[PDB]
Each structure stands twice: as structure tokens, then as C-alpha cells.
RNA sequence: GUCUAAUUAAAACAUAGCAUUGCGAUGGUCAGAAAGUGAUGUUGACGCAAUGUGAUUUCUGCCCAGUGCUCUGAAUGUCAAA
RNA sequence: UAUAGUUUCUUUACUUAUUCAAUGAAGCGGAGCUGGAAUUCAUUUUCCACGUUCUAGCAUUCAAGGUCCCAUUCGGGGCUGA
């Protein structure tokens with residue numbers, strides 16, 4: 001047969017991301033000395049829109065403690081953050097929206113975002129519009145913090161890991177219908193080439209496993225094992241259940 | 252003893268004594284003569300009626316010129332061979348692959364009077 | 373005096389760009405530097421087997437200065453003095469007709485590894501010096517055992533470069549005295565008495581003891597803290 | 606001579622001394638490049654067995670090749 | 674245009690005030706006021722702490 | 730809106746909307762002969778990937794025996810090399 | 812049931828192999844000074860900190876100061892400040 005569309009995205013020719021109008025990677029500041037012994041102050045200069053991204057970015061300016069210089073940093077803006085706001089980042093910083101405290105030094109129930117899952121990765125969990133991580137508890141010995149992620153998963157991560165206090169801005173974005181193929185087209189014009197989507201069952205069997213037939217039908221089960229190979233995985237991979245979700249997830 | 256103080260965490264290649272060549276023997280044993288002298292930048296004049304009209308009217312000499320020669324060389328070669336001061340040089344590459352130089356002399360000299368000295372008019 | 377004031381700068385965390393401090397501890401060194409440092413680190417974090425660390429115990433600097441003072445009286449001939457020696461010998465071959473014995477018998481330090489091993493096997497060696505800095509150590513790991521088997525006093529001394537300075541080379545890796553003058557045989561005996569006590573008479577017990585197993589600062593401190601937190605009562 | 610002892614010792618590769626020394630040299634050679642100049646041979650007895658002589662114009666290169 | 678600023682005189686590219694051809698007059702006023710008042714309040718924060726430490 | 734350039738412009742495809750599935754990064758999907766190699770990813774679940782149905786309205790009933798997928802592991806089950 | 816020995820497996824520990832990540836490899840580890848808590852049962856046990864949070868300002872010239880040298884002169888160096 002022929003190599004199928006999902007196999008063909010890994011080569012990354014026309015499927016790469018369109019990163020022209022992106023302002024940079026939204027990373028936390030490097031964890032150098034001040035953010036693990038005291039705090040460092042920076043200032044929000046502007047909240048800008050990032051192409052390919054619903055959440056706005058904040059350009060925060062800090063000072064270099066070792067050279068006369070004005071290193072700038074690109075944060076994902078949390079809801080309530082404004083221009084001319086002083087951001088405080090570090091161990092001994094105050095529990096206020098926009099600060100970059102560690103997770104050990106916040107109480108339980110605290111709402112944070114852009115959380116390092118490992119100290120020094122400079123930005124992970126809860127980065128998208130409206131998303132946040134909840135702190136649940138602490139293990140001060142075995143210095144660890146349990147957190148609820150937006151998926152519902154519970155995760156144990158280092159107390160030295162950092163997070164921005166508050167909620168990522170842009171919430172409520174998926175509540176509005178697009179109404180238009182064109183609105184979806186402009187959404188995906190700046191992300192990557194993954195739209196429009198042709199149904200495999202509307203194809204020929206050379207092009208897709210679900211292709212073929214004198215009626216449009218999948219034929220075999222659309223539930224594919226995890227131990228299937230590239231070219232077979234087209235459907236519902238490793239589906240524990242299937243169908244309309246009737247009740248609580250029981251997680 | 253004690254150790255050196257280093258105010259940067261970056262190690263750079265030290266500056267070492269770079270020797271110059273005075274080696275043992277020459278590369279080609281005879282310096283080539285001037286690859287492009289005044290008798291090779293100016294090949295011959297151009298005696299088209301169009302070009303001879305430029306001589307009488309514009310005080311402009313029209314020369315065939317080496318494709319390797321530039322305006323500096325053309326000016327210097329004219330001043331050398333014909334003992335004339337030059338005002339401007341204009342160059343084109345003809346459709347036949349040769350180079351044509353329009354040399355405008357100063358008002359003191361007459362292209363018309365030095366062309367028949369060169370031996371053409 | 374009234375024109376000058378005290379500014380002093382607060383080099384706290386969020387203030388006053390830091391001054392030029394000695395970052396000698398944080399340098400990104402070249403890879404050959406890191407190789408030659410982490411190698412000596414690794415050769416002592418590992419349990420060193422006694423045939424190595426038969427070395428690691430070297431001649432004290434005082435008796436080492438003494439034995440090098442001795443060996444420096446018995447030094448080989450340089451090219452210049454060899455050249456004039458053989459000019460004298462060529463002159464004597466014509467005028468005196470000596471049987472190549474116009475020059476006297478030489479007393480010199482015996483060097484060369486294949487030479488010295490043979491001297492030890494034939495029991496002609498009186499004293500042997502062995503370098504510790506040999507990069508293939510298998511060249512000398514067998515020499516203590518051999519000197520012990522054949523009854524030769526050996527001393528592991530610091531510096532193949534010192535042995536080379538002794539013998540008009542850069543490195544020698546070993547040296548030996550097989551014949552000594554009567555003016556210094558007494559000092560040679562005084563010296564062997566001190567050396568056999570330190571190397572040959574302790575061979576059977578240093579052959580049992582494994583070396584290495586040594587930790588770093590940040591790990592020895594973490595072990596000591598754990599101990600004294602466990603050893604409270 | 607020493608080369609005989611070297612030869613019979615290099616054959617005892619699973620002895621404690623030689624497996625320790627292998628354990629160290631395999632690290633130091635892994636830190637260096639895939640191909641690199643060696644100042645002198647690690648095994649001079651073997652080298653001169655194979656033809657090496659300690660005079661000018663003889664060279665030792667050390668090279669690592671991926672296994673399997 | 675940027676390269677044409679090299680052909681003109683300094684008077685055409687600046688005004689005679691601090692931060693002249695870079696910052697606005699009112700922005701300069703604002704940062705002057707801010708500097709003066711924040712340094713005065715730094716002095717005040719200093720003497721408050723100097724009072725408390727002598728007290729306790 | 731799109732397509733069989735040169736016999737088929739359509740009810741086919743796409744679409745917004747709807748639903749399901751996998752994945753919390755030592756990860757999911759995909760690539761590569763290999764790699765101190767890659768796309769997604771200048772990404773982080775309001776995300777990415779894989780499917781199906783196909784605006785709105787009104788509804789989406791019964792069957793887990795079969796084929797699949799998934800979840801459990803104390804076992805007189807079977808079960809390779811070493 | 813306990814042994815001096817040989818032997819498989821499970822659990823745990825170490826770090827130097829290996830692996831991951833970051834950095835223009837900047838502040839690690841230990842100890843000590845200083846403050847606070849601290850109960851001391853002799854004399855000190857420890858544990859916490861050990862310069863910055865009204866403000867869209869500024870923070871750069873081996874740092875001013877202090878102190879010791881040189882050879883005063885134009886200045887120059889060291890320690891401390893740290």
C-alpha cells in the first residue's frame with residue numbers, strides 16, 4: 001500500500017510549525033542564585049498577542065546581577081497582570097498573582113500555572129488559556145509536592161520546582177463557535193498544516209485502512225492495540241472503553 | 252604556592268607567538284612581469300564613423316581595451332602612451348566580447364589633433 | 373578629606389551588580405584538563421587492588437634526598453666526556469698499546485628497564501629505585517615482587533623525571549646501583565637498612581590491603597552527617 | 606627483560622589489577638575522540654611484536670568502533 | 674530616514690533637555706519626580722528600621 | 730467552498746458543530762540505515778495526536794454471546810533461550 | 812534451633828561507570844561570625860534567618876571609604892570593604 005497521512009507528518013516537511021510571528025518561547029527565568037536564595041524584581045512592559053496561541057504573553061524585564069544589562073524574559077501572562085506591574089521571582093517572594101514562587105513555599109489550595117515538572121526546565125504544566133495547577137499537599141521530608149493537573153491527574157513533583165501564581169489568561173476561548181471553515185482556516189494558518197481533515201473512510205484502501213468499500217464503513221474495529229505498528233494506528237488507539245461517556249470518570 | 256585568580260568561568264585559547272615566514276626557498280623563482288601593461292590595456296583604436304564623430308565633436312577617443320582593464324588602468328595607460336590628461340572614462344562590453352573605452356580628454360588637448368598623430372583619422 | 377564620602381554598595385541579591393569575584397571553581401575547563409583530573413578522581417574512588425597501591429607509599433623526602441645525593445656521585449658520562457675519553461683511548465692504543473684498559477673501570481648508575489630486570493634476575497643489583505608516575509603501570513607492577521623474590525632492596529621514589537635528571541635523560545622509570553665504591557658502600561648499607569624497613573619488610577602486609585575507596589568532600593560530609601545523626605544516644 | 610612479564614601479564618585480563626586498569630582506561634578512551642593520536646603505545650610489548658619501533662616516523666593512533 | 678540623520682546637525686535630532694531626543698518632556702518629568710520621591714522614601718524606610726533596631 | 734488538467738462538478742470531498750480515543754515529557758503520534766539524529770514542539774490537556782458523524786431543531790432505543798480493544802495477576806494451566 | 816562455609820533470588824544503600832537536563836559552567840558542600848527563638852541544670856544543646864515589596868525612576872569605569880607600602884608627581888600596588 002501507500003504511506004498514510006499520519007505516517008507522513010513525522011518527516012516534517014509541510015507539517016512543521018509556522019513560527020514567523022511568534023515572539024519567542026514562553027519560558028521562565030533561569031534559576032540562578034537569587035530565585036533560590038531570595039527574590040529578584042522585574043517589571044511587565046507589555047502584554048502582547050502570540051500567533052498560534054490563545055494565551056497572551058508578558059514581556060518582563062529583569063536586571064542581570066552580574067553585568068550591567070537588562071535581560072528581557074517572555075512569560076505567559078496570568079489573568080490580572082498588567083503593564084507596569086512588578087513581578088517578584090524567587091524563594092522569598094510574596095504570594096501574589098504573577099510571582100514565580102517555588103511550590104514548597106506556597107500553601108495548599110494555591111492556584112499556579114507554568115509549573116516546572118523538574119526544576120530548571122523553565123516552563124511546563126498549565127501553560128494554555130485558562131489552565132491552572134492546584135497544590136494539594138506537601139511531603140517536606142522527601143521534599144515533594146502533590147498537585148492536581150488540568151487533566152485530573154495527580155503528580156508528585158519537587159518542592160524546588162517553580163510556578164506562576166494565578167490562572168493563565170485567555171480563558172473562555174473555546175466557548176465561542178467559529179461558525180466558519182474560514183475561521184478554522186485562519187486558526188490553523190498560524191499553527192501548522194493539520195486542517196482540513198479528510199475522513200479515511202472516504203478514501204481508497206491504498207491510502208488508509210478504513211478506505212474502500214461500496215459503502216463507507218470501517219469494516220474492522222476502529223480500536224487499535226498499542227502494539228500495532230505505524231500504518232495500522234488509525235482509529236482509537238489503546239481504547240480502554242469506547243462510546244458515549246455515561247457518568248463519572250471514577251478517577 | 253597559590254593559584255591564579257580568574258574572574259570569568261570561560262577559558263579562552265591563549266595568545267601564542269605567531270611566526271612569520273622566511274622559509275628556505277621561493278615559490279616560483281621568478282616574479283612574473285606585469286600581466287597587464289599599458290600596451291596590453293589599450294589594444295587598438297576604433298575607427299567607425301560613429302566613433303570618429305565623437306573625436307571631432309566631443310574630444311573623445313574610442314579605444315578597444317582588454318576585458319581585464321578597468322578605468323584606472325585605462326586612464327593611466329592613456330596618460331603614459333599618449334602624454335595626455337584624461338577627464339573621464341566610460342566603458343562598455345560589446346556584443347562581440349571586447350571592451351570599448353570612451354576616453355574624454357581635457358579642454359587643453361585635442362583628440363582630433365592626437366588621433367592623426369596616433370595615425371588614424 | 374571633606375570631599376570624599378563613603379558610598380558603600382549593597383551587594384545583596386537584588387541590588388548592586390556583583391563585583392569581579394574569583395570564579396576559579398566554576399571554570400569551563402578544557403577536556404584534557406577534565407580528563408586528567410577526573411582520572412585521578414576515578415583511580416581512588418575505585419577499590420584499588422594491592423599490586424597497585426604497592427605504590428602510593430613513596431620514599432620520604434629526607435632519605436630520598438640522601439639516596440639521590442648518593443646516586444648523583446655515580447652518574448653516567450656525557451657525550452663530551454665520553455668523546456675525550458675515547459680520544460685518550462685512541463691515543464693510548466697507538467702510544468702505550470694498552471688492551472683498551474687505559475681508561476679506568478667506571479662506577480655508574482644502571483638504568484634501563486630491560487637491563488635492570490636482568491640485573492635483578494642475576495642478583496647483580498644492590499639497590500633499585502622505581503618510579504611511581506609510570507603511565508602504563510604494568511611496566512613496573514611486577515618489579516617489587518621480583519626484587520622481593522630475588523632478594524634485592526627496592527624503593528618506590530617520586531619522579532621518573534628526577535631519575536632522568538639523575539641519568540642525563542628526561543625519564544628513566546627505574547634506576548639501579550649494582551657496584552659501588554668503597555668510599556660509599558657504608559652509606560649504601562645505612563640506606564638499604566632504612567629502605568628495606570619501609571618497602572621490602574612491609575611487602576607481605578601491603579600485598580593484602582586494597583587501596584582507594586576514598587570519597588569526595590560533598591559525599592564524605594554527607595556520610596559523616598548521617599553517621600553522627602545515627603550515633604546519637 | 607620486561608617484555609616477557611608484560612606479555613604474560615596482559616594475558617591475565619580477568620585478574621583484579623587488569624580489570625581495574627581496563628575499567629579506568631575504557632573511561633579515559635571514551636572521553637577522548639573516536640580517533641585520536643596516542644603519544645606512546647599502551648602495550649609496547651605487543652606493538653614491537655607487531656613491528657613498532659620507538660624511532661621517528663612510527664605513529665600510534667587509538668580508535669574506537671561501534672560494536673555489533 | 675535613518676541614514677539621512679547622519680547628514681544633518683545635532684540640533685535637528687535633539688532638544689536641549691535631558692533625554693532630549695529619546696524621551697518625552699512629560700515622561701522626563703515623571704521619572705524626575707519618581708526618582709526624588711522614591712529616594713526620599715528610601716531614607717524614610719531606613720530611619721524607621723534604624724529606630725526599631727535601637728528600640729529592640 | 731473543493732475535486733477527476735484532456736468524456737463524470739454531483740447527492741461525492743471539505744466545513745462549522747457533535748462525540749469518542751491516546752498522552753502529564755524517562756510521555757502520546759510519526760520519521761530515520763544509524764546517530765551526541767529528528768517533526769509535532771518558539772508546544773503542555775481551552776494542548777497535541779488519531780478516528781468517526783456532519784449546520785440548526787428534535788432525538789440518538791435493546792444486545793458485550795462473536796470478532797476486536799482494554800483491565801486485572803496469589804495460580805496442580807501452557808510457555809523460549811540462558 | 813545456632814553456626815563457621817558454599818550458593819541462588821528479593822529489599823535497601825553508595826557513587827565512580829552509564830543516562831537525563833541546564834548554564835556565557837557564578838555563588839555548591841562543610842564550618843564559622845552576627846541577630847532571633849531557645850532550655851540551659853554548667854557551659855552550652857541545638858533550630859531558624861545571616862542587607863532588596865506603596866511607586867512603569869536610577870543602579871556600569873579593578874568601588875568609594877578604611878589601612879599598609881612605594882618614593883611623590885602626573886601618582887602605582889596590596890589587604891579589607893565582600
Ligand SMILES: [Mg+2]
Pocket residue numbers: 193194195196
Ligand atoms: Mg491543508
Ligand SMILES: [Mg+2]
Pocket residue numbers: 202203204
Ligand atoms: Mg472515492
Ligand SMILES: [Mg+2]
Pocket residue numbers: 001205208209
Ligand atoms: Mg491496507
Ligand SMILES: [Mg+2]
Pocket residue numbers: 201209210211212213216217218219
Ligand atoms: Mg472500508
Ligand SMILES: [Mg+2]
Pocket residue numbers: 213
Ligand atoms: Mg465511493
Ligand SMILES: [Mg+2]
Pocket residue numbers: 342343
Ligand atoms: Mg557600465
Ligand SMILES: [Mg+2]
Pocket residue numbers: 684685686687688
Ligand atoms: Mg531640535
Ligand SMILES: [Mg+2]
Pocket residue numbers: 733
Ligand atoms: Mg474530466
Ligand SMILES: [Mg+2]
Pocket residue numbers: none
Ligand atoms: Mg465537465
Ligand SMILES: [Mg+2]
Pocket residue numbers: none
Ligand atoms: Mg459528506
Ligand SMILES: [Mg+2]
Pocket residue numbers: none
Ligand atoms: Mg517526543
Ligand SMILES: [Mg+2]
Pocket residue numbers: none
Ligand atoms: Mg528451556
Ligand SMILES: [Mg+2]
Pocket residue numbers: 834836
Ligand atoms: Mg551552572
Ligand SMILES: [Zn+2]
Pocket residue numbers: 696697698699700
Ligand atoms: Zn512621552
